[PDB]
Amino acid sequence: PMPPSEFLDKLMGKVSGYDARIRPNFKGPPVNVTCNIFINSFGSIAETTMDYRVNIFLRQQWNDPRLAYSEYPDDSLDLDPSMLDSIWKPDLFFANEKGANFHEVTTDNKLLRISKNGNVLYSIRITLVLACPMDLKNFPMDVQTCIMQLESFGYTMNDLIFEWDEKGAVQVADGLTLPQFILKEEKDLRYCTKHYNTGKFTCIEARFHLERQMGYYLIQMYIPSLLIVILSWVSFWINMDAAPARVGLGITTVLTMTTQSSGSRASLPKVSYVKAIDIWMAVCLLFVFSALLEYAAVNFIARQHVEEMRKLFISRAKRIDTVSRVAFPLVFLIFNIFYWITYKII
Amino acid sequence: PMPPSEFLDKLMGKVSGYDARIRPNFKGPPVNVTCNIFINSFGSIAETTMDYRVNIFLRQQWNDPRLAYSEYPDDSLDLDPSMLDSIWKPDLFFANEKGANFHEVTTDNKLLRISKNGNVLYSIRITLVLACPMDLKNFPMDVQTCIMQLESFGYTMNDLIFEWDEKGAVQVADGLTLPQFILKEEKDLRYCTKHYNTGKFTCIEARFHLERQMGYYLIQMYIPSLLIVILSWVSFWINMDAAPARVGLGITTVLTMTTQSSGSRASLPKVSYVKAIDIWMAVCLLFVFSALLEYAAVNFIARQHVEEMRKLFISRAKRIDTVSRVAFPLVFLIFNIFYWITYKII
Amino acid sequence: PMPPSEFLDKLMGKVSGYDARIRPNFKGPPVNVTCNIFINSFGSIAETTMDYRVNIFLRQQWNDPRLAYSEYPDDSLDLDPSMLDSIWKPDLFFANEKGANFHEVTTDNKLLRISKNGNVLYSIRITLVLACPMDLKNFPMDVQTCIMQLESFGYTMNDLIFEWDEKGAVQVADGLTLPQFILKEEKDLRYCTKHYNTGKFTCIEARFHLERQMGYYLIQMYIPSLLIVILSWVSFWINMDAAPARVGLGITTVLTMTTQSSGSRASLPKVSYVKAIDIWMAVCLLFVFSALLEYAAVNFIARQHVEEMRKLFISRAKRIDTVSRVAFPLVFLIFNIFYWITYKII
Amino acid sequence: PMPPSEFLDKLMGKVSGYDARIRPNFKGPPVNVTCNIFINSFGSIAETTMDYRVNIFLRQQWNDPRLAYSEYPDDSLDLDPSMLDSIWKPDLFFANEKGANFHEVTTDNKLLRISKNGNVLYSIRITLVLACPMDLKNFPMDVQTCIMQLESFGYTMNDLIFEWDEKGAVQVADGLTLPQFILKEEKDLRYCTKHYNTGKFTCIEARFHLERQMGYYLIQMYIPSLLIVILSWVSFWINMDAAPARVGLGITTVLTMTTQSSGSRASLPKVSYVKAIDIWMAVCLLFVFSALLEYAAVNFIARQHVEEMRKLFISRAKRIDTVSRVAFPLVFLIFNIFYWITYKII
Amino acid sequence: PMPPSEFLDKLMGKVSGYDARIRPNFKGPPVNVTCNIFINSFGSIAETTMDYRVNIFLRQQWNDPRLAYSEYPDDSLDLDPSMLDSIWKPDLFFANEKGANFHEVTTDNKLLRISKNGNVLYSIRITLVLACPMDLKNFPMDVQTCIMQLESFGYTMNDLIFEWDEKGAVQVADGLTLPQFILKEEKDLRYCTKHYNTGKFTCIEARFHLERQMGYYLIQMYIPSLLIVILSWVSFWINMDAAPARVGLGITTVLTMTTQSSGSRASLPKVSYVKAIDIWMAVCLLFVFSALLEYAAVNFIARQHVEEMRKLFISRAKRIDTVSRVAFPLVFLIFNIFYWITYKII
Ligand SMILES: *[C@@H]1O[C@H](CO)[C@@H](O[C@@H]2O[C@H](CO)[C@@H](O[C@@H]3O[C@H](CO)[C@@H](O)[C@H](O)[C@@H]3O)[C@H](O)[C@H]2NC(C)=O)[C@H](O)[C@H]1NC(C)=O
Ligand SMILES: *[C@@H]1O[C@H](CO)[C@@H](O[C@@H]2O[C@H](CO)[C@@H](O[C@@H]3O[C@H](CO)[C@@H](O)[C@H](O)[C@@H]3O)[C@H](O)[C@H]2NC(C)=O)[C@H](O)[C@H]1NC(C)=O
Ligand SMILES: *[C@@H]1O[C@H](CO)[C@@H](O[C@@H]2O[C@H](CO)[C@@H](O[C@@H]3O[C@H](CO)[C@@H](O)[C@H](O)[C@@H]3O)[C@H](O)[C@H]2NC(C)=O)[C@H](O)[C@H]1NC(C)=O
Ligand SMILES: *[C@@H]1O[C@H](CO)[C@@H](O[C@@H]2O[C@H](CO)[C@@H](O[C@@H]3O[C@H](CO)[C@@H](O)[C@H](O)[C@@H]3O)[C@H](O)[C@H]2NC(C)=O)[C@H](O)[C@H]1NC(C)=O
Ligand SMILES: *[C@@H]1O[C@H](CO)[C@@H](O[C@@H]2O[C@H](CO)[C@@H](O[C@@H]3O[C@H](CO)[C@@H](O)[C@H](O)[C@@H]3O)[C@H](O)[C@H]2NC(C)=O)[C@H](O)[C@H]1NC(C)=O
């Protein structure tokens, strides 16, 4: 009969004394809050900052006996967020926020329904910029594991406990994809119960596995790394006589790799350890330096020399020919097969 | 007689009991809300982020019987937004906001008029930064289809339904243009009714087709890609004798394309698949590498050699001349005609 | 006697019934609002965004008969903005805001005085970031005309009309200058009365003419464009015999222009049409390519050749000398005189 | 006895009628407000924007007879900013704000004490981003004079007047330094009384003198400008015979200066006039172009030529030797001594 | 019995007269406030700005006799931050904020418990962007000491005093690390009691020592600095006869160092003094300039010359050979051993 908001005026109003400043089950067991998330947006995973932005629908559920309506004939009584500041709400924060905000476009993006037995479904749209430290040992073939963990800031573990629900604690949007990663379907769910000099607080955290789309880096970095090598090999297929041709083909290619390695770590943090993309472009350096270093041997032995003179110099230009025409493709290919098996096993 | 705002004090005030926290037609059919938009601003379509900013006038219309004034002699009773927080308003949010805000310069940019029969026109200026994933298979000749979709966050499909109005659901400003695209006049309008573990919610979405102005990329990228080829052809129109001239004209041009392809994907996301602008600048690579690779053949056969010697070496420098003087323009032009027909058919 | 704020407690308070939610002259003629602006800041005209930031003092004046004090012995009764939310205020917004904000440092930067006959002077400091589409046909010699237009968002043309005042509708700060433009003193003032599917609304807009300081671009772009040409001419003043000197002076200069044109459109939007700065740096390309193309002719005819042989080859190296020693300065200067007259007439 | 805040409940409360909306000395002389500042932070002087950020403690002092407590036995009655919105406060704004904000971390950073005779000390932490137009005639040796000026926005000069106090109107933090400038101890204090079509308003402004640390620019710009010159001089100490060595040493150095001047005005606004750093790097251009221009003379006269032939050509290669071996160090050093005295006198 | 929030309605409410605007121990000794922090986030130490962002849990403790509950049977009475604006709170600000904000995601991240004897534990999550001037004498091997200092803004030293607690005044997160530094465990704690023309205020500050991960700079900067040297040494292992080979290997390497030093101070403020990374890359300059300077000697003495002629020129090419083949590795290695011991002792 009476309008339910008018019903809720006495549901939680000064009549019946719903004090929003006192958790349910006061002085009893803690408040068991089941949580799950829904991921609209995901991406902008900046490694310069080692964070990422997500746009989730945080759903919470707890049981408040003070909210147990009985007269009403249905199961759910939704209510606009205008009085969402009227009921008790758990102080779930994100232990690695690094910035977050509500969405208030045309309305507070909030949801509030209440079952007969006091079950409170509480859902709000959030945009987080979560911090996840990036492990970059094997950079272009890394599997980053960024996390988001939900703690309680004020209430201790003996008054408020979080939990994930079993029926799909983490849903993802239907066509949600990324420009650079693959959000692997397996998603871990484990506790991260904290301790301070103030007490112990509740935590739960879902670990998102991330694997890179190697297609991009395969193009901008590896192929340019690979052309300079083959360009540095036919430089040895140059004319037999040492002329300024090898003078050009040598230093030109080395200068490429010098600039390549510059833009190599362009959008990369200043990590002290050595990653995998650079040792590729390191080995690519010492081969292209082998070219200018090899002609040093040729131009050295050539200026040495004349029967016995030319008979021994060209004998050096020949053994140096039949070796470099296969040695560079020999070690460079054996290096490649070893490099990629090292990273195809992780 | 009485001032209508003073009339509205009893229109929605505590007299007559207009509770703003209870939707119209409560416990009856859902609230049928017709929507349309008006686009002032449009642009800043960043592909680094794959989003875009728009400045719209969202108009809504629903019928609230509680707002049915009868005494008054006219059709419309506008009212400043100061009491726009006084009436019920649907919680239309944008399912792909990624940031949005109201405009509050000198007044809340809001509009509110009410017909005799309870029709509520509600219009507000909004600045959205909407997320649209970019498909970049054929990059400079792509037709991106960015969308904006209007969902309800709290009310389920059985209590609130959105709809587009038939009489021009999407107007565009008179001289609205873009720096890079053409907002095609055809604009699609279809439902995107959602489902969650909470229920099903209303959605409507308008698909904006976008086609690129190819004029820019035709200049900064293609012509510089095209000069290096012709510069790499008259390099073969060099003197007959193999001199360091071809030493210069070869590696110089190849270094251009190396730097060209660097700035090629300058403002482009790190997409794993291969787009169309790069295979252009890829084929431009393997021709300019053909130049330095061709002189490798010339300088190789030249150092081989003398009656029978010169009689067979210059016979190779001639067949290599009459072929390269037409072969590069042969395959390069046939490539061009094939490339552009592949992209003039989409 | 009584304090005038205490006087204004009954001026607009619940006594005498000043309802701030009802415009003056209700049900009568529209409210004639005269406006003018004062420009403190102006600049940051970003062409990457095609907008600009301004810091104005928007003065408004309308007549409200409800504000007609009679007892008081003076003309003006100022009042701090603390009760500036107490009176009626027109909802003037900026039709091309693209971001704007009030200034609230140590006080709301607001002004409010009221004449005896109800005249309301209302002035507030605003920082706008206004959108003006840039026309870049003739880029370094363009005259951009950015605008700012003042519309009413809620009230229709039959209830509220804006106007500029005749006595200097737009003042500019005394020493206000720009880093790149000259704010021409002539400032246009014309209506932009709008129409929608909701009605017709009031508008007024002041067109600011802007002309560029060509001094900067004359230095960073044109001179470097001009040195490469003269460097590409004395390259032909090289030794008579074709040596690797022309091998160097040719490709070196062309590589400059390639990088010049890269940084040419560095801070420029991706406009499809062709502007004027590039056709300059385009013509500068085809002359420097003429150098490497000319030596192609020299090195070609030289390798052709010997009495009749040298007697006809050097006859070609001579006619090619007396022509290129004046032809490049011939066409290049005639091009310059034509280019600058094309742009000195607009 | 009674708690002084409870004392201030009747100090300014509805008892005794302290109306915060009415300035002291109403209808009498204007309110004489003495001001001074204290500078915590200072820096981020961006010339791309021509502004700078400061973090000051604005102290104000005015006398309000309505605040004259008599019963109390002490001189000062501080009070937390919670009731700082309760008293009258002057509307001091900053005429060149360009952005400013309060600091609200753990409390509004505000101070409020009141002497017996009504003296109000009012102090608040502010972070300003003030606009100062930069004069860049002599760029690396410029003395910028940025200002900050304190106006009143609402009250006219006949109702409110600002003043600096004599006892150290501008204090600076003890170890406050800058990365690029030296905040000279002399700080000017003069009025900037304004006039509009609304009246005349109070102003005071303190002029901060700033002088650059020339040490940085002496390293990144001048030394690289200076190495290319000496590298372009020993290029003339090359072998007597004109070989491709001068072919290399000439164009290589000129290309450096071309890229040097690119990054010269890297972080510099697009000012039309010519500054001092560029004419340095301009004169450095025309000397390095003299090198490639000089070898043009050598390679020209060399190809001219043979008894009388070589007897006159080498006579030109000798007079060109004994001159260039001292002429470049002659004019270049005389240029340096003239350049630096032009800028050591300002 | 009664709900404690309802108990706190009379704990601090208008009954019993808890005036939040009056510090504890009024007119007595100052309020002794013990503080400690807990560091979640730490990093983004930008030297371009010379600041850094931290995410701390500021815990405060003071004793307020007015908050002494006696009836209740326990030690602690937590309470949600909804009434955290109800009690007195010290106005601790950060003397070098440069920007800071609260975290309000799903609740104000705040904590409030009260012991029986009035002890108030008050803890709030804060994100600071603190200013620390960077000392960059020895840049890649520097030990920066950034600070954060906690002052009181309003209350003087005779009414409010801060202190650190002895039991671990500064805790750090368990796995908190940085991308570039090592937060040394030793953390200093000393007073910074201030003085102004208003009085003396309380301060405490914790000095965080920071030492760099030299691993990154060891790779991007030093190795490229080191390859050019060895590339500039085997350039002297070139053929005995002076050919254009040394023409290439000389200027090519010098151009590398020119571009190296460009990107050397890429992300570095414009400090006037000379740091350590540049004198490394300065000494690397004058060795690679020694190469092109050395061949100047070779090509000079070579063109001088013929029995006595060649007998004295090659005698110079030999003593120049046996010296440069060890002199560059001689001085360069002795330089290295001296450089690194200068920086391994600090
Ligand atoms: C929130 O969930 C926790 C997790 O179960 C609940 O704690 C558990 O509550 C049950 C119900 O009383 C306890 O069962 C009893 O345990 C005692 C001692 O173990 C046993 O002797 C009894 O026969 C009975 O089985 C259980 O011990 C207790 N466990 C823990 C770890 O707390 C809690 O009650 C829930 N609170 C709410 C408000 O839902
Ligand atoms: C909002 O619009 C929807 C769409 O039409 C309305 O739902 C429709 O309402 C009509 C009016 O009663 C229903 O017509 C009746 O349907 C029954 C069963 O189909 C039929 O036996 C009756 O003879 C009569 O035609 C219609 O069924 C119903 N359809 C749906 C899908 O809901 C709704 O009433 C509107 N609500 C408001 C508040 O305007
Ligand atoms: C705001 O300014 C407009 C512009 O003038 C005012 O509208 C004009 O008001 C005058 C005053 O009554 C009207 O004059 C009368 O016009 C009728 C019909 O044209 C004529 O027969 C009468 O003899 C008399 O001249 C005028 O028509 C009217 N014009 C328009 C276009 O509205 C308006 O009254 C002003 N409102 C306020 C509140 O100041
Ligand atoms: C704020 O400071 C100004 C600056 O002094 C005060 O104005 C001055 O007030 C004195 C005090 O009455 C005036 O002195 C009188 O001047 C008249 C005419 O000059 C003279 O005949 C009298 O013998 C007496 O000396 C002075 O003229 C006046 N000057 C100005 C420029 O206003 C003002 O009173 C101060 N207001 C407050 C609230 O402190
Ligand atoms: C906050 O902590 C300070 C630091 O101790 C307290 O100040 C100290 O308070 C004690 C307690 O009365 C004073 O002791 C007395 O000192 C006098 C003179 O020195 C001596 O003759 C007495 O026999 C007795 O020892 C002590 O002097 C005083 N020192 C200072 C520097 O203030 C303060 O009382 C504490 N306040 C609160 C509210 O906890």
Side-chain angles (χ1 to χ4, degrees), chain C residues 155-176:
Chain C
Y155 298 96
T156 65
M157 185 68 72
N158 57 4
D159 289 333
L160 187 149
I161 298 171
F162 287 165
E163 291 290 330
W164 295 107
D165 58 357
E166 295 180 354
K167 292 182 179 181
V170 175
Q171 296 87 18
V172 179
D174 194 359
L176 182 63

mmCIF file of all heavy atoms in Angstrom, chain C residues 155-176:
data_model
loop_
_atom_site.group_PDB
_atom_site.id
_atom_site.type_symbol
_atom_site.label_atom_id
_atom_site.label_comp_id
_atom_site.label_asym_id
_atom_site.label_seq_id
_atom_site.Cartn_x
_atom_site.Cartn_y
_atom_site.Cartn_z
ATOM 1 N N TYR C 155 16.475 29.046 -20.907
ATOM 2 C CA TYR C 155 15.392 29.946 -21.259
ATOM 3 C C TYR C 155 15.361 30.159 -22.763
ATOM 4 O O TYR C 155 16.409 30.254 -23.404
ATOM 5 C CB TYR C 155 15.567 31.272 -20.534
ATOM 6 C CG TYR C 155 15.524 31.127 -19.039
ATOM 7 C CD1 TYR C 155 16.690 31.021 -18.312
ATOM 8 C CD2 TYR C 155 14.323 31.073 -18.359
ATOM 9 C CE1 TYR C 155 16.667 30.882 -16.950
ATOM 10 C CE2 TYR C 155 14.292 30.936 -16.990
ATOM 11 C CZ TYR C 155 15.468 30.841 -16.294
ATOM 12 O OH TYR C 155 15.455 30.703 -14.926
ATOM 13 N N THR C 156 14.162 30.233 -23.326
ATOM 14 C CA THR C 156 14.016 30.371 -24.768
ATOM 15 C C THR C 156 14.126 31.844 -25.154
ATOM 16 O O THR C 156 14.182 32.737 -24.307
ATOM 17 C CB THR C 156 12.697 29.769 -25.230
ATOM 18 O OG1 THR C 156 11.613 30.523 -24.679
ATOM 19 C CG2 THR C 156 12.583 28.339 -24.760
ATOM 20 N N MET C 157 14.141 32.111 -26.461
ATOM 21 C CA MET C 157 14.296 33.474 -26.947
ATOM 22 C C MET C 157 13.130 34.367 -26.557
ATOM 23 O O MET C 157 13.283 35.590 -26.553
ATOM 24 C CB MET C 157 14.453 33.471 -28.462
ATOM 25 C CG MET C 157 14.739 34.829 -29.056
ATOM 26 S SD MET C 157 16.350 35.467 -28.610
ATOM 27 C CE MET C 157 17.363 34.394 -29.606
ATOM 28 N N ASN C 158 11.974 33.799 -26.234
ATOM 29 C CA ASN C 158 10.840 34.612 -25.822
ATOM 30 C C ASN C 158 10.826 34.916 -24.331
ATOM 31 O O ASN C 158 9.912 35.605 -23.866
ATOM 32 C CB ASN C 158 9.527 33.936 -26.232
ATOM 33 C CG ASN C 158 9.381 32.545 -25.663
ATOM 34 O OD1 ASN C 158 10.221 32.082 -24.898
ATOM 35 N ND2 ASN C 158 8.301 31.869 -26.032
ATOM 36 N N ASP C 159 11.810 34.435 -23.569
ATOM 37 C CA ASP C 159 11.907 34.743 -22.149
ATOM 38 C C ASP C 159 13.243 35.330 -21.727
ATOM 39 O O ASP C 159 13.333 35.840 -20.607
ATOM 40 C CB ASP C 159 11.646 33.490 -21.298
ATOM 41 C CG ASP C 159 10.195 33.056 -21.328
ATOM 42 O OD1 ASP C 159 9.318 33.916 -21.538
ATOM 43 O OD2 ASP C 159 9.928 31.855 -21.122
ATOM 44 N N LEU C 160 14.272 35.271 -22.565
ATOM 45 C CA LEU C 160 15.572 35.809 -22.192
ATOM 46 C C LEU C 160 16.377 36.083 -23.452
ATOM 47 O O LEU C 160 16.551 35.192 -24.284
ATOM 48 C CB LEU C 160 16.315 34.842 -21.266
ATOM 49 C CG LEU C 160 17.626 35.321 -20.648
ATOM 50 C CD1 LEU C 160 17.830 34.700 -19.287
ATOM 51 C CD2 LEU C 160 18.777 34.948 -21.540
ATOM 52 N N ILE C 161 16.870 37.313 -23.580
ATOM 53 C CA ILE C 161 17.608 37.759 -24.759
ATOM 54 C C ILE C 161 18.904 38.413 -24.309
ATOM 55 O O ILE C 161 18.895 39.269 -23.423
ATOM 56 C CB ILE C 161 16.793 38.755 -25.605
ATOM 57 C CG1 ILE C 161 15.519 38.108 -26.121
ATOM 58 C CG2 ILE C 161 17.614 39.249 -26.765
ATOM 59 C CD1 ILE C 161 14.586 39.086 -26.761
ATOM 60 N N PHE C 162 20.012 38.025 -24.925
ATOM 61 C CA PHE C 162 21.298 38.654 -24.670
ATOM 62 C C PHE C 162 21.560 39.773 -25.667
ATOM 63 O O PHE C 162 21.013 39.795 -26.770
ATOM 64 C CB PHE C 162 22.433 37.634 -24.738
ATOM 65 C CG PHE C 162 22.489 36.709 -23.565
ATOM 66 C CD1 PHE C 162 23.245 35.559 -23.618
ATOM 67 C CD2 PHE C 162 21.804 36.993 -22.410
ATOM 68 C CE1 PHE C 162 23.309 34.711 -22.547
ATOM 69 C CE2 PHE C 162 21.866 36.144 -21.333
ATOM 70 C CZ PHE C 162 22.616 35.003 -21.406
ATOM 71 N N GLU C 163 22.415 40.707 -25.262
ATOM 72 C CA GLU C 163 22.828 41.813 -26.111
ATOM 73 C C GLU C 163 24.200 42.280 -25.660
ATOM 74 O O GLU C 163 24.566 42.135 -24.491
ATOM 75 C CB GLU C 163 21.837 42.978 -26.045
ATOM 76 C CG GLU C 163 20.488 42.717 -26.668
ATOM 77 C CD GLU C 163 20.558 42.616 -28.170
ATOM 78 O OE1 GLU C 163 21.430 43.274 -28.769
ATOM 79 O OE2 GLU C 163 19.735 41.886 -28.755
ATOM 80 N N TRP C 164 24.958 42.844 -26.594
ATOM 81 C CA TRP C 164 26.165 43.566 -26.228
ATOM 82 C C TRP C 164 25.811 45.018 -25.951
ATOM 83 O O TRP C 164 24.915 45.585 -26.576
ATOM 84 C CB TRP C 164 27.222 43.524 -27.331
ATOM 85 C CG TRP C 164 27.782 42.184 -27.646
ATOM 86 C CD1 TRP C 164 27.532 41.442 -28.751
ATOM 87 C CD2 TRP C 164 28.685 41.421 -26.846
ATOM 88 N NE1 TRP C 164 28.230 40.268 -28.701
ATOM 89 C CE2 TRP C 164 28.941 40.229 -27.534
ATOM 90 C CE3 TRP C 164 29.299 41.630 -25.614
ATOM 91 C CZ2 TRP C 164 29.785 39.253 -27.035
ATOM 92 C CZ3 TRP C 164 30.136 40.661 -25.121
ATOM 93 C CH2 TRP C 164 30.373 39.487 -25.828
ATOM 94 N N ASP C 165 26.527 45.621 -25.012
ATOM 95 C CA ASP C 165 26.371 47.045 -24.776
ATOM 96 C C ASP C 165 27.203 47.833 -25.776
ATOM 97 O O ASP C 165 28.211 47.347 -26.296
ATOM 98 C CB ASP C 165 26.753 47.412 -23.342
ATOM 99 C CG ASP C 165 28.165 47.020 -22.991
ATOM 100 O OD1 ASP C 165 28.854 46.416 -23.836
ATOM 101 O OD2 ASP C 165 28.586 47.314 -21.854
ATOM 102 N N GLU C 166 26.766 49.056 -26.053
ATOM 103 C CA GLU C 166 27.411 49.838 -27.097
ATOM 104 C C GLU C 166 28.728 50.441 -26.626
ATOM 105 O O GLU C 166 29.674 50.561 -27.411
ATOM 106 C CB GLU C 166 26.469 50.936 -27.577
ATOM 107 C CG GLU C 166 25.231 50.417 -28.265
ATOM 108 C CD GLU C 166 24.328 51.534 -28.736
ATOM 109 O OE1 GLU C 166 24.620 52.705 -28.420
ATOM 110 O OE2 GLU C 166 23.328 51.241 -29.423
ATOM 111 N N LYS C 167 28.807 50.825 -25.354
ATOM 112 C CA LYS C 167 29.968 51.546 -24.838
ATOM 113 C C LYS C 167 31.095 50.557 -24.561
ATOM 114 O O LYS C 167 31.363 50.165 -23.424
ATOM 115 C CB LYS C 167 29.592 52.332 -23.590
ATOM 116 C CG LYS C 167 28.644 53.484 -23.862
ATOM 117 C CD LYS C 167 28.349 54.270 -22.601
ATOM 118 C CE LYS C 167 27.413 55.428 -22.889
ATOM 119 N NZ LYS C 167 27.124 56.223 -21.663
ATOM 120 N N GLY C 168 31.775 50.159 -25.629
ATOM 121 C CA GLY C 168 32.932 49.298 -25.485
ATOM 122 C C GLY C 168 32.599 47.920 -24.957
ATOM 123 O O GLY C 168 32.924 47.589 -23.815
ATOM 124 N N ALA C 169 31.938 47.110 -25.780
ATOM 125 C CA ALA C 169 31.529 45.780 -25.360
ATOM 126 C C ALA C 169 32.697 44.845 -25.069
ATOM 127 O O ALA C 169 32.494 43.836 -24.391
ATOM 128 C CB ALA C 169 30.631 45.156 -26.424
ATOM 129 N N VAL C 170 33.900 45.132 -25.560
ATOM 130 C CA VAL C 170 35.040 44.245 -25.345
ATOM 131 C C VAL C 170 36.271 45.093 -25.066
ATOM 132 O O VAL C 170 36.844 45.677 -25.991
ATOM 133 C CB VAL C 170 35.292 43.322 -26.541
ATOM 134 C CG1 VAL C 170 36.542 42.516 -26.317
ATOM 135 C CG2 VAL C 170 34.119 42.406 -26.745
ATOM 136 N N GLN C 171 36.689 45.150 -23.807
ATOM 137 C CA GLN C 171 37.933 45.801 -23.428
ATOM 138 C C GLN C 171 39.040 44.764 -23.350
ATOM 139 O O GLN C 171 38.781 43.592 -23.072
ATOM 140 C CB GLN C 171 37.818 46.511 -22.081
ATOM 141 C CG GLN C 171 36.834 47.643 -22.056
ATOM 142 C CD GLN C 171 35.443 47.165 -21.746
ATOM 143 O OE1 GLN C 171 35.261 46.066 -21.233
ATOM 144 N NE2 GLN C 171 34.450 47.987 -22.055
ATOM 145 N N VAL C 172 40.269 45.196 -23.591
ATOM 146 C CA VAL C 172 41.437 44.338 -23.483
ATOM 147 C C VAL C 172 42.395 44.971 -22.486
ATOM 148 O O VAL C 172 42.429 46.198 -22.345
ATOM 149 C CB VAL C 172 42.106 44.134 -24.852
ATOM 150 C CG1 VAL C 172 43.336 43.271 -24.726
ATOM 151 C CG2 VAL C 172 41.133 43.511 -25.809
ATOM 152 N N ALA C 173 43.155 44.136 -21.780
ATOM 153 C CA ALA C 173 44.112 44.636 -20.809
ATOM 154 C C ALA C 173 45.110 45.570 -21.479
ATOM 155 O O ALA C 173 45.308 45.543 -22.695
ATOM 156 C CB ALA C 173 44.843 43.484 -20.128
ATOM 157 N N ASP C 174 45.737 46.415 -20.664
ATOM 158 C CA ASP C 174 46.536 47.511 -21.201
ATOM 159 C C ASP C 174 47.747 46.988 -21.960
ATOM 160 O O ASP C 174 48.020 47.411 -23.088
ATOM 161 C CB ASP C 174 46.958 48.445 -20.070
ATOM 162 C CG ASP C 174 47.494 49.765 -20.578
ATOM 163 O OD1 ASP C 174 47.560 49.949 -21.810
ATOM 164 O OD2 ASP C 174 47.847 50.623 -19.742
ATOM 165 N N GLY C 175 48.491 46.069 -21.358
ATOM 166 C CA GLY C 175 49.682 45.565 -22.007
ATOM 167 C C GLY C 175 49.555 44.138 -22.488
ATOM 168 O O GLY C 175 50.560 43.440 -22.642
ATOM 169 N N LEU C 176 48.328 43.693 -22.732
ATOM 170 C CA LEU C 176 48.088 42.312 -23.135
ATOM 171 C C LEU C 176 48.700 42.064 -24.503
ATOM 172 O O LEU C 176 48.335 42.718 -25.483
ATOM 173 C CB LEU C 176 46.594 42.024 -23.157
ATOM 174 C CG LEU C 176 46.244 40.586 -23.519
ATOM 175 C CD1 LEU C 176 46.796 39.655 -22.464
ATOM 176 C CD2 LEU C 176 44.747 40.416 -23.656
#
